[PDB]
Amino acid sequence: SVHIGAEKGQIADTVLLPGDPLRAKFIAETYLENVECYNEVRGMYGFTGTYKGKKISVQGTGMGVPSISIYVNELIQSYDVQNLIRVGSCGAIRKDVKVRDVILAMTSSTDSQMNRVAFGSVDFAPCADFELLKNAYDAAKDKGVPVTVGSVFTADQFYNDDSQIEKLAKYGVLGVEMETTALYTLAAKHGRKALSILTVSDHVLTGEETTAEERQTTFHDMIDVALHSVS
Amino acid sequence: SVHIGAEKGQIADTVLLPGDPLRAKFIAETYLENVECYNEVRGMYGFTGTYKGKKISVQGTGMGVPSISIYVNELIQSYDVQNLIRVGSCGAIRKDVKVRDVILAMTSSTDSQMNRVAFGSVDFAPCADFELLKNAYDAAKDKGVPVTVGSVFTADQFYNDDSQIEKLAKYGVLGVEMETTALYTLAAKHGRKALSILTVSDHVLTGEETTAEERQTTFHDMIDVALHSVS
Amino acid sequence: SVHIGAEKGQIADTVLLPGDPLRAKFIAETYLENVECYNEVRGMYGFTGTYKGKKISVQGTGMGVPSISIYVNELIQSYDVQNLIRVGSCGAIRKDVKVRDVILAMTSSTDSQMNRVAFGSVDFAPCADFELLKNAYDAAKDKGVPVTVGSVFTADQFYNDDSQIEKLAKYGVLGVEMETTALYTLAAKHGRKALSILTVSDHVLTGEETTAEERQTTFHDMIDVALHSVS
Amino acid sequence: SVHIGAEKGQIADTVLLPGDPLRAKFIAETYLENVECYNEVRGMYGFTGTYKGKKISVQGTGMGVPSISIYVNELIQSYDVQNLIRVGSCGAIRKDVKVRDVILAMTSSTDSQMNRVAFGSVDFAPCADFELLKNAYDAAKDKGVPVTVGSVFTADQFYNDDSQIEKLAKYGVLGVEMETTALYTLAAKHGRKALSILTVSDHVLTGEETTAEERQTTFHDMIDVALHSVS
Amino acid sequence: SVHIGAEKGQIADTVLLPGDPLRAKFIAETYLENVECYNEVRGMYGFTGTYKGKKISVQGTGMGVPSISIYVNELIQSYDVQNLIRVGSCGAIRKDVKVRDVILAMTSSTDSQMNRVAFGSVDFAPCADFELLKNAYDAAKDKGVPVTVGSVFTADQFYNDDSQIEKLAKYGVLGVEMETTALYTLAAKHGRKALSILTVSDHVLTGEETTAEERQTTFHDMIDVALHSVS
Amino acid sequence: SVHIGAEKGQIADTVLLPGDPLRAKFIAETYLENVECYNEVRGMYGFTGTYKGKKISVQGTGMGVPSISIYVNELIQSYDVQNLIRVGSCGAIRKDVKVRDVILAMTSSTDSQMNRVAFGSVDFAPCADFELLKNAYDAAKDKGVPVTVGSVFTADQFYNDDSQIEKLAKYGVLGVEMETTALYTLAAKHGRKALSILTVSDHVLTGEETTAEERQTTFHDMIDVALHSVS
Numbered sequence A, B, C, D, E, F: 001s002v003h004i005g006a007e008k009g010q011i012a013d014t015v016l017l018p019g020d021p022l023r024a025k026f027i028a029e030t031y032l033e034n035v036e037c038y039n040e041v042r043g044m045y046g047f048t049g050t051y052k053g054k055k056i057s058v059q060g061t062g063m064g065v066p067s068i069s070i071y072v073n074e075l076i077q078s079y080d081v082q083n084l085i086r087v088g089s090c091g092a093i094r095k096d097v098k099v100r101d102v103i104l105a106m107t108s109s110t111d112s113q114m115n116r117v118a119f120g121s122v123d124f125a126p127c128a129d130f131e132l133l134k135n136a137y138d139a140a141k142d143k144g145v146p147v148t149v150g151s152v153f154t155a156d157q158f159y160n161d162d163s164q165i166e167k168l169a170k171y172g173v174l175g176v177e178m179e180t181t182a183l184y185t186l187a188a189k190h191g192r193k194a195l196s197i198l199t200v201s202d203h204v205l206t207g208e209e210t211t212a213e214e215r216q217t218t219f220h221d222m223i224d225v226a227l228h229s230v231s
């Protein structure tokens, strides 16, 4: 594949997809055994190791629809990946979305043109694979991890002068990140299973930051949910 | 309210929403006790009765985004309805969607302009209330009712010369109906809970019809799931 | 046809199209002789009778582009209907549109995506059949029924938070209803003749309601114009 | 006004609007008495004279929405013009539109973005002033001039590689020209009256040309209808 | 060609394109030797003469995308024209654009739908031919003519109630005219070379007019740059 | 700044912007003296060093409009960067674009919605800063580096099932990459100067790859042009 330097069999059936390739490294080293780095192209690291004797890969995606779309397309088309799970963060856009909440996205809205390019007059609603989502939901509930299931907004512009998050929040949308629409659309288009699990890095409308301790905790809950869900 | 002749308190917290007002009548009379018709305006019947001692209303919506939007807006704004559950049918657009399957829609795509009118450049993905959906899912599973969770397409044109259902099917979409986008968007916009449960009336791409017996069976499973889910 | 339970020959060449199927019943029983109900599917009644020895049908359409599109497509495709005449009401959006005025729509604007779905970058202007319109206009003038000829707006959302009726009014548009664009487009696409005759139920911008007596009078003028026009 | 060198009072209440300023000159000199040229700016001639003792102006518009929009805006805003009548030609796009037919446009479709710029998600249907149209229609009928009333298509591209005229024809549209949408929209926006009367210069789909004699005849019928209509 | 009455060979390889056909006449008579008028159709004059022994044509385009598109398409397709140079004016929309500045447009934004008609979801950025632009730039610099290189906005509406020039100015856009997008797109589509050289007729946001002397001077600089660039 | 860990003064006035942060490292180490890495966040390295005694930074952008938009916004807003120069590659889409050619983009087309989000009905044409472009052009010419000046296409989807590059090529567009629209728009919006210099990595329509030696050579020419241009 053009952007991933792996050899056949080096990538697992199940790939976790953080945005930050240094977080991919952190996840692999902290959570998995017998880790190998199968990719260094562009410094977008990918790794494979085991969790409870089961192979799992962790691949950085970069930020934004166009970057994740590259990695997801290649993982699917060249490495026959079956389960793709984004583990990232988002900016919460409602007060009722708590800093400790782990978010499982059922769907995502977007201002990316990717789906209008394919469908024109149709609004395509991307959809999480329900089996992955329900497993993740059960795993959170079992351990008492606070979890909220709803939708997010996949944004093209981190700094958007024409942001509609205020209106999106009133329509129930939970938070804003930069990947989910692409992940969910591309996995579905190829008959694979996808889910995004997100932590809250801040409230964008109040500007209130989540603390370092808060972030470390929710991140560990996200990774546990991601792995527990698939064991 | 302009289109519903009910008096305050006559409509329950929970409303079932068939498209066909003769099916609303059928549901109420067959499933509920102590039934009263609270609405005859336009012959779009609505009824209220009890199921296991709990009040439940059943309101016809008519067909298409514009018609359901009228009834959903009025139910919410004038009657403080909390849970809105569409019980309808759809045309299946994938072979893997079986005629006996009961569909719980996580989200819906659309060619209605309703959300571009509000959001312009944003593709708004509507979202089922997860609590209703999970309850409905558990109730199906408990009894062994075959159930599939995914997305549908809300169409403006039953006869569409420019239909994209072929492409929609390849993106994983399950079937086509005429209401869900509006229900899910309008409920979310007002902080209420919504879910669409759908049976399969045919396969639109093969033209193959589901039999009368098949339809009667799935319809009863849909109504059981709808009611069991909320008891 | 899927939504109309009639047998061949049961529907006349000329069909009147009220939105409310209880008004279809009222029109048939009050104005026609030798009436039969040819349709009860979904309670969307249709009837056929005679006026001055000439067969005339009256078919409810429901509300909104998607609902009328179903009935108009079936009437045309399955019953070879030649003349389709909407008899309905609208909310006036200009002070110069008087509560007693009967409106003959030359064309309609819309926020429905139905025509962008077919044409994309083209704004399709629907067009009344001039022969029907001129006949209706002559019949009004002959009897002194106040009549105004201009355009309307076909709306998808009865409750629209992003309504542009203020701007539409400044561009000369007379009033807002939920059907005309679909009727005019679908009739033209199949070489049939269509016209919408509308009464005024209120002024939407002043909130001022037309009285019951006012409504009964204009409704009778509309039906006379509709029938006189075609005798 | 920026593009018209006339002094107040030099332009009549009623202006005829050919596209070609040499045709404006021809119309004035051939049909009117006591003619003066009130405009030579850009060689887009305008003239004023009398017909049966009544003042009438004739102003070239140039070709395309942007050019006519300039002249129509200035005529209205700076010269208080009340009646604006386009007298031009179009390419017929249906076989049933005969080379001798004089076309009165009730409305026009377009691929110009002018109305999406103002309305976004709304398809604005422009509308002829019915009083002018009916007068023109009566004047044609009185003398036996063959006349057809329907819609046209206002095109931005005379040479359009993505032309949809084939589909437009199937929807009943009569022919294609380059002005009407702008005329009808701008007149309505300012409470003035507008009408387009068009001859047929060819059939665009068959490439068949109308002869010089044919064109001279229909042009004279158009001008008679235009003037008779307003006497 | 439909709109140009010239015979083969009558039009030069290089055509200057003023909007105003009276300015085409002025340019030819003032700057060229051995001038002949090859076109009088619609009074949109075109002329051919020599400058320093080299053939050069000057053709009026009219105003707006649709009008220039006609002339540019015909010049290219029927007369094998290789270099097309717009010499016109624009309304400056930034204070830093000085009344004496001659503008060479690298590209243009637009509210014309011409390119969305061809490309839909793509924003097509038109592009000047760099060789013409650089030659024009060198010729200005050589003589000390003040020159600014950047983009313009091609507008459909001279009187635009929804004008975005304020925002366009903040994005660096220099001024507004009515032709460039069409010229640059159509020349590129056919492998020919195009450039727009523009003077400043006013500042649209301050309403400040450039004087007659100012306009005569910049116009002469524009024509010198246009001709010097191609000798 | 959120994504860049530098301290004030650590980033130069002039920043080179490769997509690949490992190429940023390579450029800095190979071309500059007294290099320091000022950023390791997300492994998106940035470095500052000197070239001929003048400070120059080199910052990885990642791939796609959303990723570069983050880095460009932060460089401008938080580090007062004045000159931003993308040094990257593109897939050539015309045969006349030679593998050795260094491309200077005057403008870029896109299927990103970023500008429709800001402008709606306007097609915004981004524009290179001419001074940077001309300097780069002169520096190439001086040394005999083959150089082509024209436009590119900024794509959201590296794997695009609905790619229009065939049509884009016929309109003169040179090649496809994933950054330029964002760079040019965001720099202009903030009064800074931007340019994209691109090498050719392949011909996308012929699938023909450029060799390793070819790529190493053109890359060195690009970097020389980038640096020579600004000394």
Ligand SMILES: Nc1nc2c(ncn2COCCO)c(=O)[nH]1
Pocket (backbone or CB within 6 Å): A019, A062, A063, A064, A088, A089, A090, A091, A155, A156, A157, A158, A159, A176, A177, A178, A179, A201, A204
């Ligand atoms: N677009 C956007 N994404 C955010 C914000 N806060 C956190 N994220 C999610 O990180 C980007 C995912 O790579 C924000 O304000 N805007």
Ligand SMILES: Nc1nc2c(ncn2COCCO)c(=O)[nH]1
Pocket (backbone or CB within 6 Å): B019, B062, B063, B064, B088, B089, B090, B091, B155, B156, B157, B158, B159, B176, B177, B178, B179, B201, B204
């Ligand atoms: N649009 C559409 N809806 C369908 C079809 N089959 C079943 N439904 C769902 O019924 C309409 C919901 O009121 C079909 O072919 N098209």
Ligand SMILES: Nc1nc2c(ncn2COCCO)c(=O)[nH]1
Pocket (backbone or CB within 6 Å): C019, C062, C063, C064, C088, C089, C090, C091, C155, C156, C157, C158, C159, C176, C177, C178, C179, C201, C204
């Ligand atoms: N959309 C809309 N339609 C109206 C209004 N008032 C009357 N009508 C017309 O009735 C709907 C046609 O079925 C209004 O305020 N909005």
Ligand SMILES: Nc1nc2c(ncn2COCCO)c(=O)[nH]1
Pocket (backbone or CB within 6 Å): D019, D062, D063, D064, D088, D089, D090, D091, D155, D156, D157, D158, D159, D176, D177, D178, D179, D201, D204
């Ligand atoms: N766009 C277009 N207009 C035409 C055609 N034939 C005649 N007209 C009308 O003339 C243009 C009005 O100024 C054609 O083929 N296309």
Ligand SMILES: Nc1nc2c(ncn2COCCO)c(=O)[nH]1
Pocket (backbone or CB within 6 Å): E019, E062, E063, E064, E088, E089, E090, E091, E155, E156, E157, E158, E159, E176, E177, E178, E179, E201, E204
């Ligand atoms: N659209 C527009 N064009 C202008 C303005 N001022 C000068 N021009 C350029 O003249 C039109 C080109 O034929 C203005 O305010 N608006």
Ligand SMILES: Nc1nc2c(ncn2COCCO)c(=O)[nH]1
Pocket (backbone or CB within 6 Å): F019, F062, F063, F064, F088, F089, F090, F091, F155, F156, F157, F158, F159, F176, F177, F178, F179, F201, F204
């Ligand atoms: N979108 C796209 N970009 C390309 C291609 N080839 C090279 N590039 C440019 O690299 C992406 C810039 O980060 C291609 O086929 N498609």
